[PDB]
Swiss-Prot record, chains A, B:
Native organism: Homo sapiens
Lineage, broadest ranks: Eukaryota, Metazoa, Chordata, Craniata, Vertebrata
Effect ascribed to mutating R547Q: About 50% loss of angiotensin I cleavage but two-fold greater activity with angiotensin II
One example of a Gene Ontology biological process annotation: negative regulation of ERK1 and ERK2 cascade
Membrane topology: Single-pass type I membrane protein
Posttranslational modification: N-glycosylation on Asn-123 may limit SARS infectivity. Proteolytic cleavage by ADAM17 generates a secreted form. Also cleaved by serine proteases: TMPRSS2, TMPRSS11D and HPN/TMPRSS1.
Protein name: Angiotensin-converting enzyme 2
Effect of L62F: Increases slightly the interaction with RBD domain of SARS-CoV-2 spike protein
Effect of R592S: Slightly inhibits interaction with SARS-CoV spike glycoprotein
From Swiss-Prot, chain C:
Species this chain originates from: Severe acute respiratory syndrome coronavirus 2
Subunit relationships: Binds to host ACE2. RBD also interacts with the N-linked glycan on 'Asn-90' of ACE2. Cleavage of S generates a polybasic C-terminal sequence on S1 that binds to host Neuropilin-1 (NRP1) and Neuropilin-2 (NRP2) receptors. Interacts with host integrin alpha-5/beta-1 (ITGA5:ITGB1) and with ACE2 in complex with integrin alpha-5/beta-1 (ITGA5:ITGB1). May interact via cytoplasmic c-terminus with M protein. May interact (via N-terminus) with host bilirubin and biliverdin, thereby preventing antibody binding to the SARS-CoV-2 spike NTD via an allosteric mechanism.
Effect of F40V: In strain: Omicron/BA.4, Omicron/BA.5, Omicron/BQ.1.1
Outcome when changing S31N: In strain: 20A.EU2, Iota/B.1.526, Omicron/BA.1, Omicron/BA.2, Omicron/BA.2.12.1, Omicron/BA.2.75, Omicron/BA.4, Omicron/BA.5, Omicron/BQ.1.1, Omicron/XBB.1.5, Omicron/EG.5.1
Protein name: Spike protein S1
Effect of N55T: Reduced host ACE2-binding affinity in vitro
Shown chain mapped onto the complete sequence: 447 to 545 of 1273
Location of region: Immunodominant HLA epitope recognized by the CD8+: 2-10
Receptor-binding motif: annotated segments: 1-62
Annotated consequence of substituting Y59H: In strain: Omicron/BA.1, Omicron/BA.2, Omicron/BA.2.12.1, Omicron/BA.2.75, Omicron/BA.4, Omicron/BA.5, Omicron/BQ.1.1, Omicron/XBB.1.5, Omicron/EG.5.1
Gene behind this protein: S
Amino acid sequence: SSGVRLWATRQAMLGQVHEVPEGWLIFVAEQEELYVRVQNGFRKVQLEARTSTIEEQAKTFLDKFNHEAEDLFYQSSLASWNYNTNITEENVQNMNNAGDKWSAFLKEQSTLAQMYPLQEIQNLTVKLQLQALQQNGSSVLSEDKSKRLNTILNTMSTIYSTGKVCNPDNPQECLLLEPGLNEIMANSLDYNERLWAWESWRSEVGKQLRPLYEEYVVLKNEMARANHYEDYGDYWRGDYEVNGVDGYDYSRGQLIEDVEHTFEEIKPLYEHLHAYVRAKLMNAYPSYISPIGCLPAHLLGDMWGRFWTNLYSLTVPFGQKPNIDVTDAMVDQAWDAQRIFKEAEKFFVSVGLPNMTQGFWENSMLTDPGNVQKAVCHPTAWDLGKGDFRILMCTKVTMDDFLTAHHEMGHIQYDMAYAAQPFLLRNGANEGFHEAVGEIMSLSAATPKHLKSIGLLSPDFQEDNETEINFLLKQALTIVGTLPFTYMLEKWRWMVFKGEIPKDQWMKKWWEMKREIVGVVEPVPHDETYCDPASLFHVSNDYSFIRYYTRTLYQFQFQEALCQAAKHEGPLHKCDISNSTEAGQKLFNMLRLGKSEPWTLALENVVGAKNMNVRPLLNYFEPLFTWLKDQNKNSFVGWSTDWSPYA
Amino acid sequence: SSGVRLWATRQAMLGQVHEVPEGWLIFVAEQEELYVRVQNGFRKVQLEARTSTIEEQAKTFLDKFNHEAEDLFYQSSLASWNYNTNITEENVQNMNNAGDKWSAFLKEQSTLAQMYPLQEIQNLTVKLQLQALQQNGSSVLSEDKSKRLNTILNTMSTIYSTGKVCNPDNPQECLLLEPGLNEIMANSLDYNERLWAWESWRSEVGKQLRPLYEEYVVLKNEMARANHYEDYGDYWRGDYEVNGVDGYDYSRGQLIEDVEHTFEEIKPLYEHLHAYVRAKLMNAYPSYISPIGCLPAHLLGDMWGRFWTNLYSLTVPFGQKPNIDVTDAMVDQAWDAQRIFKEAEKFFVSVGLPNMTQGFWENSMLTDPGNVQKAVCHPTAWDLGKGDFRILMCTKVTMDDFLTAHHEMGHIQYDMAYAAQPFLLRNGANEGFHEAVGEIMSLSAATPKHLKSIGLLSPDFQEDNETEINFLLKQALTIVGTLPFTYMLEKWRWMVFKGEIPKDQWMKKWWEMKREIVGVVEPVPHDETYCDPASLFHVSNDYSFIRYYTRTLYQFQFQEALCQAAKHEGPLHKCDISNSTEAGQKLFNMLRLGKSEPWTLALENVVGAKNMNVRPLLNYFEPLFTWLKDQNKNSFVGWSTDWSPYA
Amino acid sequence: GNYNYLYRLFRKSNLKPFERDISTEIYQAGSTPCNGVEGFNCYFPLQSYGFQPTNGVGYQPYRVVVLSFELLHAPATVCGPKKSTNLVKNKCVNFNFNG
């Protein structure tokens, strides 16, 4: 013993001096002060002034790769932005060529990185970067298995994107999922029209995708075994996995544990929320919604019941008190996309974050990019590299565009935060961190205190409890509404990749937890021909939906840390972090690392805990929970799986 | 590789450097010097210039307690001292009121100290001080149990004090134990007179204290059992218990066997001593002590048979030969108690111990201040605190009081010696150290060498073996004689606390142990109605009687070590530590430590033996041991338990 | 005991040279706030002195005066006695009249 016992600050040393054993060096990492642990305290130690292995070759190989990678990635990034801004055939070709150049280049380095054995490589950053490169992808399988898996992904993504259903009343009248079916599942309130749209989408897509999905899963599973995973779920569980880090290693199975462990705390709030929606639905559809039965899968505000936000019309806590809107004030104050972005930039400056790049304005587009060029209006950030930061969207004078602008800007702030890190580390620690950071900025941007501070919300405006309940429930519909849907679906892919559910029970098991975990009942029964669990975008397009679940746990914890940092006074849903420079600095310390460090370390450095939890959400919706329990003390609370609209 | 080991002191590492492997850095916590262990020596590495937790709160909690504890204890000691030296109603009020507030102060800080656990404390001193504070004692039980236990002790204290037995000849003529009954069996040699007083007290006290003793023992055990002890004997055995110290841990059960083992090897010396007393008692009581039977209880020169000092008149080795006493020379030089205490002060400066403050002398009652105010003449020490010291003794100009002055001042020097220790640690290592220090110096003072040096004894005094045996036997009767009685009484009390001796067999086993361990048999058959063991002041008032046996073992070890350090030659009873400055410095090494260190470490450093032993006892009385065998060859050696004066 | 005297055995920081601290704030040991009152990890820095004639010599009240002899750009003010010798006359002497 009597070795190196080093920590960050002297305050840690004062609290841990009794912990440090006799003879152990007390080195303060931040203060660069060295002390020796002696009898009842520490003594000052004299310090002087600050001054071919394969691992050395790997460092040369890795850095050399970066310079090539930076250039080629920029070409692919630019080709994408040009194609995204203007969808033309020429824009496609360069995107293909740059992507083909980029993809081919990466595998050569991937194979070359695999030539380096990581066991003899001890640098934490270097070893992580190499394995981040040594990943061979689908090439770990055979080419034909890679060919099948990729082509199916091309087809499955195409089928979901091109999934179009036709009503039996008119064969020629066919409506896509968007905007045809989704508007019907959200805006239309007809029992049959929503039932048909829900049924037809899962019929013409699920039946076609089910054979493709069956082969897709095993292809994804066998590569996971080829990549040393129990299933492709564990392959996606390796994304949050932390290995080799003392005090921060995160096992893949722990991801399943934490998601289920945190989900059980959401059930009581959700159950009363589920009962209240059932209580409100039975006020609108008493026949279609039983007081004890589950909520029909076609009356949930969207195709799959993913979000209950569109049910706010039928489940409004207080019709006389609408949600706080300052979009008209923006119209009154003549605010527009550049103004909103400038206000967002000012808000980011308000929390101490640096002002965003001016080159963004020259390069990125905010409003609708006309019609000659073809572009997507969805909020999309663009960290093209080499200091090139952009956001591609059509921003109008609306809160949603205002909030998503904050959501997208936070990504860019995160993008430049880890831009100092190498290209391999130039990304978020996990898939949900950047999105979670984007959300909390929008949430703070949506705070009425911020709106009142900036003048969007008038000073004489009052935030009554009914409005807060209206706000919280709308938050619950958006956030807590999708949590059970996210929890089961990701867990569904977990067991499907693990093969727990046999082919002849994928649909039956889906409806088993639909009515039980989520309390959602299919209006008409579906069999294994249907592939409704894969009918969503992420499952069809092979995206781990856990990102939404993880970020929601992260964002509330981060916001809770923000509220603690900003010293919020009031309801947690009213927590505004405006004019809180220190919180941005603390957030910057997390964001500056990006993915250079384990996400558990970053999570603890912000919220104080190395594990995600839903404790802020319970605090966030605590007044709402009491109101929901008060509203549900009369109506039945829970859900009966046996009941169904078809029986 | 290599390791670094730190030393508190440079000299400890210098003597522990050869076994250190080469390459280990040599660092000392005091000199802060850098050395590297190299081949056959060490190279001095050049060094540059010098550049919450419960335990820290625990350290601060103790220090604040020490300030108020030192103040209130000083007032309590002062108030009690006034009552002793001046026995008046108001002085009694001061002694009671100050003690009550001190008692109230002790429990309040003890309760507050309970919120400072001992396990997380790294400092043994900090943990030990709180452990003394956190000792709930009788309060671990319910409040009624403590009150009734004190009620028994109050009744035990009053009854023992007021125990008066009336002579059958005159019912009005009644005598208390002190000084009436004690003088009967110490001065009067009439067997019947001693027998009546011995039986009357044990009958009167026994019939009223036996039922109280049964309950008092149970109450003492129950709190000990709740205080994690097997019995109240183990509760008292925790005084010598050592825990948490490497190389010096002492267990409570180790105390039992050490006292037993030490006494067993004393028996061959004691059996000859018992035989000679038995042989000499026949010369005065031919029909009352058998040549093989055990000694009569009241024929031992004292009340309980504890001290055989008065038997020296009847069992003198050579009555014609004089005894070591310069009491006449004390008054031939026109001295007094003040000069006697001055000689006691001269004794400490002769052995090298520093002189004490004059404040002690001006506050100490060395002689009774007349008769208008009553001064308690019971020898005691007063470590009042804040450097205040007093001696409660009506010392006169006599050799007997000359040793008493040395004995009491020995406690005072010891009490001030560990003043550097905290108030909780301002005490002796155990209950047999301060008495040991004062006894050995008095014995050294009583030697002819000390008396001749200061002119108390003429140099023409004949230091022949005739006076050597007479002095040894008188010391043996006082010191060696009380060891068998002290050992059994604590052993008997231990089994009563442990419940081993049946309640209907306490009296028989007490005398059976007296018959066997001590070779002393009661003159009248006492049943369990009697409470002869509790007739002692210590047993009734709940005083651990093992302190005297340990003190006797410690003092001889202390004395022999001083004589060995002073290069004493010849019989050990003539050893004088006067004019030996090294002996006091050697003695003072433990005296400053006090009770912070284990007593085993204290005993080993002073003497050389970690545990107790009887080797100094054999060295002190070796001429007597051979002399006893010469006188005891004509009579039985040992004792016979069956014989009794009543049968 | 002369309890009028108080002494600061614990201070938040070591005093600067010639610096006086007379703060009566409740000294805090751990992280538990005191809020102006004692209790857990909270004590009184200005402990009261208990001084009695019977106290030990090292514990007795000793009066101490520290004489800081500042000499700076400010003109000197505190000089010594400047002992003067006797007067002479009609004799060649080395006279030093005030310099």
